[PDB]
Amino acid sequence: ADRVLRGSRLGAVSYETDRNHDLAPRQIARYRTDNGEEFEVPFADDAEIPGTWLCRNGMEGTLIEGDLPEPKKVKPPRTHWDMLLERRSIEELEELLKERLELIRSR
């Protein structure tokens, strides 16, 4: 299919001029990960400072400060114990473990 054919990138092309002055001012927080790090992350000077943030490591961490908002909202996994307790009862496992624990109790 050797013919003069055009395709496409995605994104934007701009012919804006260059300069190194009159930019918006900033603010610097230094978030702290679990593995003892300080990451100078520049933020725009008019902004909010959130609690959790994925960092340059590729992990999340806490702030420079010691707010400690919440170690919560996570859920336990659906374990095999729950999948047992759906189709089997507590009496089933108590008497069944009286059977098996009898069987090792009589060896």
Spatial separation of the C-alpha atoms in residues 53 and 60, rounded to whole Å: 5
Of 17 and 73, nearer to another protein (C-beta) is: 17
Longest dimension (CA), the chain: 88
∠ CA 100-106-107, rounded to 5°: 80
Options 32-40, 64-72, 93-101: segment touching another protein (CB under 8 A)? 93-101
Q: Is 11 an interacting residue with respect to another protein (CB under 8 A)?
A: yes
SS3 17: coil
**Alpha carbon distance 57, 28 (integer Å):** 18
Rule CB under 8 A: choose which of 2, 35, 36, 75 binds another protein.
Answer: 2
Residues that bind another protein (CB under 8 A): 1-17, 19, 22-24, 26, 41-44, 47-48, 50, 53-54, 56-58, 80-81, 83-84, 87-88, 92-94, 96-97, 99-101, 104-105
